[PDB]
């Protein structure tokens, strides 16, 4: 009998197109290939982090945990799949009991004996009303939720390892520029020390140069700490150590990530795995509704066995000592004064709760992909302003170098312009890292790189 | 009879008065109307914010989830309410079985038959010592805890929506001020371009103005990203988007909130819902003590059913085929190695755990309201210092404007003072937003607006 | 016997030597006294902080929660320990039933009667293949896991108390130096007001001095907020009020901590308690395997009771009414579609999930210890840079004071020299506090002071 109600997908309350604004460009609309289709071998153009992701494909702990949990829920589904079949079980008994006089078969306290072994099925409940089929659907939906959870864990691990590698790649060049700053400040301090030893400058200019030398040295120590912490973070996110057979990495400013079209929100609930996980939870709640609905109807039970029984032990396996049994049973409670109706109410409440959580997850996913669209719309113009600033600092440094090589001004006002140059370009490298991290997070939230290659 | 232990509320280890110091303002004594009495329609002075809170009352997911969970705990309380009543039902039974020759009463392999359809009570659980009453009280306490969870969720939602709207307004005002800064830098760069094209200024003075206008352009892009993302963070918490027919949003420095007396910490013992969660969990643990202690006592069961039974089928519904049953049983385990004793002291330990977390919730609430009192005592003076800074910069700009229009200075050293004016002025909107956020989550931490109107 | 598979320790995937770099110092190899060896009392050299850890030893809430959960899992272990023994119980029985004529013993609607008081064992399983022993040491391993959770909570509490106390001292020193800043700014504003009232200085210098005075007055309120909020956090971590009988505190520049050797990656395999909790979860999953392995084997059941039965109520306690029963039973289900196989491989999969989580915990602990080693390798040079920066500003201030007292420059340049002096001085307390916080977190993650002294 059919008792699970018809499943229906709840409506997405968000707008069917992405909202616009001054930070956003033009919505390209729906496209042929969204971010769930492009694998991670095609998105990241650097081969080194690709080989790192290929290492983390098998050497990570949480991916192994989720891959085992998939098989766990598969075995839990197969347990209930086996429970639909009748359970054959060897049951061996034995009886030696005394009785009182008024209750005996003799009218006297005789010690009666009995022995019997049997095999067959006991309490074979027939799924006429779809209770065990509902539990089968519930175990199947939980297994599907587990594999969607493995997809989500793999995509988040890919994004985390990618951001850690790009952060290390940024901070290496930033440490190089801070070493350049320390060298510039050491040259400036040596020049002012020479000028103080000759007698032109006072002690105060020497102190005020040393106070900025110490500031550059402290910034160098901070950036070395950041480099080391990004290294040991990438080591943890990889599981194994950093390999030496890696290919040459590519620099940040040339494009390492391909562009993905924005698509539409609706295909995102077709493609993002946690929305499918909430959908599987909703279908599991509907299966529990079907189970609680099948709890109202009567229960059919069957017990059928065959074996040999006797009074003594050696006379059990004799010829003619066989015995068969057939008993059907029907159970139906009547006075359910708020037990089964409250259970059905509990199940309907669980379905409505999973509906609300499904719409909540839809709205959350829409919020983060809209934030990614905003970061995409703004970081290009931010790095354009940064690159123009670095260009202006470079022209300033070239003019100061021409002025120095003519002989008009000294090495001090060449050195400070040299300092301004790379303290501008390290603040280009910072926010180059931020556009790279924002694009990785936008690729992850739009469906992620569950597959390796493009479908 | 009932052997549930008596309930006593533990003593809070906090100070009876609010702590004092230097930045602490003077306490206004006992609060006649605290924050839990004050509704959200009276606290926020903006009609636009109250309209969107009225939207978020009905069109959010987790606020619906909490109410559905309240209905769920009501249903599971009704289950253990119905548990006290006996469960009668119909039981149909068929029997066709062979017997061995030595064990039969006739001495033959008899294929005997039996049929019957009985009606009545089987295994009637009798609550003689309040075990089922203790489970009913545990279900009721969990229902009250789920009831308080909806108030906690509504207060956190009201605070989050209020702070999100305030951050949106503050970001819009700061975006307008960065637009003015970009206009000022554009005018100054055009004037330096004119001076360089004439021949009075060198290229270096052009390059530094270019760096200034590029840095301001990057800051404008960053603040436009902030404005674009805070609308997303608001629309996510609202569920729906921003409506078109909205009331006029009042100003940030204009009064948007009302004063709330902090009163006493003991009033928070009546008013913050998480302490009520810990209290309901404590009483549920006491109900579990009652259950585990009533598990010691003997359990009485009853089986009484009547109906028709026969050897054959069509002779079931005959005259005189009726028969009744009466079987009272009493089960009592005696010798264990402290099994039920371990269940009993396990439940007592669960009570002591709930006492300890009941005290830690009081300590967390005390620390939160003390941080709110510190922010209240500091922000009113910090914003006054910022306002004095703003008016000093405004007097500076006015004197520079008079000095410009008399002809003494050029437009550049008017524009830089005009620039310093609103770059100091955005530091009023910043920390005005922080004072408003501190007052909002202090209002939430004191109990919040669970009701719409003040009682 | 026992079907439990024998346990052996999995492989630690990380490198067995601490990784080296430019910021990393020399590894001192393995050491006999790690962080878990010495107690917390001789580590923190402040007697006040030791007294606050001493009152945190008893007056905290989560420590009490952890000790009570330890006793809870002990009681749950004693439940399964008592489960080996037979449950001897008394079962009082009454029986009065009518029967149909074709099924009765007389051919008549006879009302048969029976009464009985019986005492003995029912359904007593005999642990032949080690299932109940597996559940017993499963609960025992969970109890040891809860003990390691208690140790982890205690070490986390000690680390949090130490960080809060040192942050209190740092914020107090920063508040004192910002008070000195407000004083010098007020003196500079008074001298500028005198110069404006005489007539030498225009109003613009007065405005731009007043803006600086307001900028320092904002920082004063911003730091006196943080002093009080950190006092609040300390009171929350302490669980009670701040004691008035405290010993004197020692400042941050004095030796507050002691040297702890980093040792080896293997030493944490013995000493950090969350790894011990993970391997206790390992042994719990292995005991789950050992409990699931007994389902394939036959199970023993026993039912044996003696007592007095009769047909009448008062005729129960009569001579000759004593009777006994002996009933053995053997159960073995045979036909399944992989039910018990999937349950067993499900338990094995849970064990493999546990080995993967056990490796992940070791990897995260190694990452945290690498962060602590990098902070130790860098904050010494950062503090040296801040210290000789302070010394340079002090020599600057002394030369400016000599130049003032000979009469060359005014009080104004002396005041703005003292301004930068204690600015660079308050920039030492930040990154002194960060070094001490990093060393406290390193001592926590390396094993912590679970004991009070060294043993």
Residue numbers in the entry:
A (entry chain A), B (entry chain C), C (entry chain B): 1 to 455
Publication excerpt:
MexB-trio adopted an asymmetric LTO conformation for all the particles contributing to the cryo-EM 3D reconstruction. For MexA-I, the β-barrel and MP domains interacted respectively with the β-hairpin loop (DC) and the turn of the long β−loop (DN) crossing each monomer of MexB respectively without major overall structural modifications. Unlike MexA-I, the MexA-II contacts were at the vicinity of the conformational changes observed on MexB-trio. In addition to these stabilizing contacts, MexA-II MP was in interaction with PN2 domain of the protomer T which exhibited a conformational change regarding protomer T of MexB-solo. The constraint on the PN2 domain of MexB protomer T at residue Q319 imposed by MexA-II MP created the contact surface which is unique compared with those between MexA-II MP and protomers L and O. In contrast to the OprM-MexA interface, the MP and β-barrel domains of MexA formed a loose interface, with a reduced energy binding, resulting in a cap on top of the MexB trimer that would allow its required alternative movements.
Tripartite systems of the Resistance Nodulation cell Division (RND) superfamily are composed of an inner-membrane RND transporter driven by the proton motive force, an outer-membrane factor (OMF), and a periplasmic membrane fusion protein (MFP), forming a tripartite pump with a contiguous exit duct. Archetypical RND transporters operate as a secondary proton/drug antiporter exploiting the energy associated to proton transport in their transmembrane domains to power the export of substrates through the periplasmic pore domain, 60 Å away, via long-range conformational communication. Crystal structure determination revealed that MexB as well as the E coli homologous AcrB are asymmetric homotrimers for which the three monomer conformations representing consecutive states were designated Loose (or Access), Tight (or Binding), and Open (or Extrusion).
